[PDB]
Amino acid sequence: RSISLVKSLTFEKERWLNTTKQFSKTSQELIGNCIISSIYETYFGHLNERERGDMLVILKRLLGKFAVKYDVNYRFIDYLVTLDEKMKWLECGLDKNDYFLENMSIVMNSQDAVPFLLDPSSHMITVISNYYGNKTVLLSFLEEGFVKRLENAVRFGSVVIIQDGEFFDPIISRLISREFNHAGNRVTVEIGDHEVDVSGDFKLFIHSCDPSGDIPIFLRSRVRLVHFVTNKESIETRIFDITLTEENAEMQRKREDLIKLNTEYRLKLKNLEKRLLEELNNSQGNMLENDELMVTLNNLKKEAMNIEKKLSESEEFFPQFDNLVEEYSIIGKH
Amino acid sequence: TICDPTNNKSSAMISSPALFNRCIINWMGDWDTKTMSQVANNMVDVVPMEFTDFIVPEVNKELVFTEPIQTIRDAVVNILIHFDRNFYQKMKVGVNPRSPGYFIDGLRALVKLVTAKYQDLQENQRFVNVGLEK
Amino acid sequence: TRLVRGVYTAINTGPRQTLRSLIRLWAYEAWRIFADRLVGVKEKNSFEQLLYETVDKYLPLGNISSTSLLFSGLLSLDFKEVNKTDLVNFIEERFKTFCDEELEVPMVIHESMVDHILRIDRALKQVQGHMMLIGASRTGKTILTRFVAWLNGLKIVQPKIHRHSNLSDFDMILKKAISDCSLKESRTCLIIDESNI
Amino acid sequence: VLKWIPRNLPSCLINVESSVTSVKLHPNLPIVFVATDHGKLYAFDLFNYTIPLASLQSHTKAITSMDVLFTNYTNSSKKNYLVIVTASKDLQIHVFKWVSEECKFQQIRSLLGHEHIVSAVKIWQKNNDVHIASCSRDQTVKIWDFHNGWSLKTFQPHSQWVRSIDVLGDYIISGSHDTTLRLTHWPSGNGLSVGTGHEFPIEKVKFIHFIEDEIRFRTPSTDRYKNWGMQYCVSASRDRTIKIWEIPLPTLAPIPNPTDSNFRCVLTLKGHLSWVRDISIRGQYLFSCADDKSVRCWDLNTGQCLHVWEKLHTGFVNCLDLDVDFDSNVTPRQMMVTGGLDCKSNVFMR
Amino acid sequence: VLKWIPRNLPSCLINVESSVTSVKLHPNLPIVFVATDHGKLYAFDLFNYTIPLASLQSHTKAITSMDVLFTNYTNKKNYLVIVTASKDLQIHVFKWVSEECKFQQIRSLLGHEHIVSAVKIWQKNNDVHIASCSRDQTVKIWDFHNGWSLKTFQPHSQWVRSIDVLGDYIISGSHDTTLRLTHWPSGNGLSVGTGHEFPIEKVKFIHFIEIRFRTPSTDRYKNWGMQYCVSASRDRTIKIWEIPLPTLAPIPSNFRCVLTLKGHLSWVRDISIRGQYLFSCADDKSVRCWDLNTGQCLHVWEKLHTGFVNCLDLDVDFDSNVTPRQMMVTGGLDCKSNVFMR
Ligand SMILES: Nc1ncnc2c1ncn2[C@@H]1O[C@H](COP(=O)(O)OP(=O)(O)O)[C@@H](O)[C@H]1O
């Protein structure tokens, strides 16, 4: 029993040994990666791709001058975004573009500042509504009855999106600044003409679909402005998807199914590896002494082999779709 | 309280003699590099940054907004001030007052992120050690 | 004229004076009267050089830079110079009390804030004292003003100007503040932001 | 005995883990009780103070005030015990027994009913009746029965919230976040008089109790005031000032006097450089402290400083306690305790 | 106050997750810090000792030692510094914030190439230093404020298991049977000694206080500041040594054993001196108390731990900034810390 399990776990031994040897490099590069990520969230919300590239060049130069190491292969998405976030966001209707994904992570990790979303297509209204599913309120600065409905949303804790953000009403200023009275065991906010209990589950978004609008200084300086606009690759992806669904729908379905199933397989295998290390960690004794642990790790290895086998077998068909994609790059470019 | 002294209404508020000859004009302006340095020194004081080797960079005095660089924190503060300055310079915001909002928000975010990721680093390494030992 | 009156108050409500302290007070009030309106750093440097030259010409003292002259009535009974460290500690404690009682704002205290709080206090201790704060957003104008008004026991009035409102509401707000200042003897600090015009 | 003034130096320095919110001397034993800002209550021996006798985490937020009473219920023939009452920012008051044979804090019960932080709590006893009164940031003053553990009386003496109360017989005198004192008859809950004259919120208010001896402000001036039981009171505020007030006399529940509804400030004390945080009268002397790292000993006969403890603490001085010289059941010991911001308390003895 | 011996039973028992490798008593508050073999550091309140005040995962391997100093700045607020050295080749320096019951990391000291076996922290004027030694046979000195090394020296051919600091001197006890006195700010070795049969587990200066071995016998030693030290090893024996006087860096001269204490059945794991009494513990599951004047065992705590006692803590009696509280702490393999109060 013991020899068989350790022989099976030799793979994890090798991976673990490599990880602990890379620990030194991993710790050296942590501060630089954190600096890059914090700057990227703080400054790049309202920049295009080229501007982000330029600013990352400047920041890497500053990191070099002041002797702070960083991952030369740093990527914002890979560093901060995990599989669960990617899958849920795409399932809610998010575009597959890297630019939209980066902006999505930025707006979802705005824990302290009210996010202000510029989306000319009002796609993010749909995405956010699908994400929260229900208990989502759509108000507008441009309609009557705004104050009362916002008061109720505050009191009960619904997720509010206020449309037409260019018509910002300072009557809700205390929400933007988050200047609350911590009244003993309660937290309240002064809005309109009186004090309203903040449930604590209340979340606020401001949305505008009018680019180059007018955001006053008070709101502009206190919100995390994120632009959700299309680019080359989004247009080309949509054009190809239309081309493929019109020309050959069966390959469309097979491609989508393969992609979804492989991503789920990857997530399952990752979580299984995590469980293996946690189970071996909390042994309460030697592995031989704990026979239940031995059985558990054997079963986990069996599951891992099955998952990896399924992914490896399914992947063999995806180059067919690669060639099918290359067939229509002409339409994409033009 | 005036934020943009070049706006039409704010310019009227400043040049109107009814207000000019009675009020004390206090030019708050914006934060200079020394104020930014002090705020940063307060903010990153609680971040566990000193967990790696650090070699003091060789930089000119005009590139240092702090005391001479000895620690990683000094380098981080200088990097952040320089990046904010370069952001405003390259974004070309004219002669508008340099709002410190970006600097403040980035500092808070950096504190939170470094805390979380350092915790993850230590826990992962501990689990790996235990597995190999077992 | 303002400078004259400034000097008077410092002598009238201050401790026993020496010639050194007298000249330092004169320089402090010169900073408050003439230099607070200057914008660029070069102009401030030129003003400091001008103070040194003027003193040497007429009043032949230590360092009299803008941040070397911290006259305050917050830490003592008379109006006198104070130690930077003591004032920082006092401001931090009083600001924690202010957060507990009025509004929690997690802002960092630094030297520029100490200079600005002292000059704002000076302004709000004058008869018919009025001040206009010009600077970037989120630099601490409104909250610092509120904190000073709280220290001096003034009622803080912020007109609730919002969309779908007009001069009738603004007139009503001003009328209420005026009536309370007169008939109720309510010491009032009325904060008017440019966005409320 | 009552002529005693503390020495210029503490008899002992007692260290705690954070800011001291209040202190009280044990009325009979050489024990001091200290409540801090993290919800913790401590008991220290004054001869072996290097290790606490006991501690208890009772609340979860800062303790805002503590009062203590040693019961005197002779008729029942029951075991009399020290009751320690604390109130916190958790909108609660906790009532404990001091078990001297074990040196522990034994919780007796808890009192609920406030909507905000409690700013003061007081406990007093009649022949066989013990009451607990409190005032809080919800603007109400509430009196509970100690034994029964539920509210007896409620009233709202101020439009702003109440910061300090003191109780003498069947009256409560309350200072508030407003600048006005109010005197109310607590059994019926009818306000009687108000005292204006302060510029900033009130930190403390206390009755001035008569002494059987002569003292300027501790003796009645007429037969009416003598029979009433009160002539003066003292308050201190954030305007760096302590005022001695002459109490108006209602028509004797008492009837508000249409022409004598105002307090008369008879003496003003100045000399502190900051907010006055505590006051206490012993003999002819008024002892007080401020947010200026200092304590002062005032001569009540002339209204002057007699002695000053400068830089007694490295931070603000938060609390003083002396014994009661107007109660036959309390020995006026040569003891003083001061506690303050610097995570320290100083005990002056002999 | 000093003439105090703990009772037979502890006032408080504290259980932790695994074996206790080091324990230190908070110099001014009733708080005990416990560093275990899994890289974790706990802070317990002695009156609320079931759930720890704080629980920190600081290292990834076992903690081998730690030391504590409460700062005394002459200008700048004072606070408690905790120095923790582990098998990860790292020394982490933390600030204890009593206001939040948390370990706020100040920094880390790197540079040793093997397991760090001991640390010491002391202060001069407003300067704070950290000395340490490790299995790489090197003894290193860091400046607290700067965060990098100050001095380096090697006193032994075998690696140093423990050190102690007095004035500007260090006695280092080797993995060999020998012990060596070196001058701290130069690295100049001053004296050597042997007498043990097995590696030294502990060594420390004996400080003069107002006792047989705690006063200078000559004005030369009074001027020097030290005359005696104590050490113990795996030969089950505790040895009290006279320190020879150099040509007063000082120029070199052997340690002379002046009194031998015996009685343990196993390896000596801790030395601690309080006034007239020497407290120690061994790998025989016992703690014991000898008289420092006569060299006899006065009291024995048998079966205090079901495993081997790893460490003791008693207050300093040779510092004006330390209150000699009647409180002693013991900690050992069996996941237990026994605290004796009054
Ligand atoms: N010294 C400071 N430290 C941290 N944050 C600051 C500081 N000064 C200003 N801020 C930020 O600016 C805001 C407070 O300034 P405020 O008085 O609101 O400026 P204004 O109202 O004039 O825009 C808060 O959002 C705060 O985080």
Residue numbers in the entry:
A (entry chain A): 3291 to 3624
B (entry chain A): 2890 to 3023
C (entry chain A): 2623 to 2682, 2686 to 2822
D (entry chain C): 139 to 351, 354 to 392, 397 to 494
E (entry chain B): 139 to 213, 216 to 350, 355 to 392, 397 to 400, 405 to 494
The authors write:
Cytoplasmic dynein-1 (dynein) is the main minus-end-directed microtubule motor responsible for transporting vesicles, protein complexes, RNAs, organelles, and viruses along microtubules. Dynein is autoinhibited and undergoes conformational changes to form an active complex that consists of one or two dynein dimers, the dynactin complex, and activating adapter(s). Dynein function in vivo also requires Lis1, which is an essential positive regulator of dynein, as shown by genetic studies in many organisms. Lis1 is required for active dynein complexes to form, but how it enables this is unclear.
Here, we present a structure of two yeast dynein motor domains with two Lis1 dimers wedged in-between. Importantly, the Chi conformation is not a consequence of the E2488Q substitution in dynein, or the use of ATP-vanadate in the sample: we also observed Chi in a data set collected from a sample containing wild-type dynein monomer, ATP, and Lis1. The AAA5 and AAA6 Chi-specific interactions involve residues on Lis1’s β-propeller that are different from those involved in all previously characterized Lis1–dynein and Lis1–Lis1 contacts. To disrupt the Chi-specific interactions, we mutated Asn213 in Lis1 to Ala (Lis1N213A), Trp288 to Asp (Lis1W288D), or both (Lis1N213A W288D) in the endogenous locus of yeast Lis1 (PAC1; GeneID: 854443). On the basis of our structure, we introduced F3446A in AAA5 and E3867A in AAA6 (Dyn1F3446A E3867A). Although we did not build the side chain for E3867 in our model owing to the lower resolution of that part of the map, this residue is a good candidate for mediating the interaction between dynein and Lis1-N213.
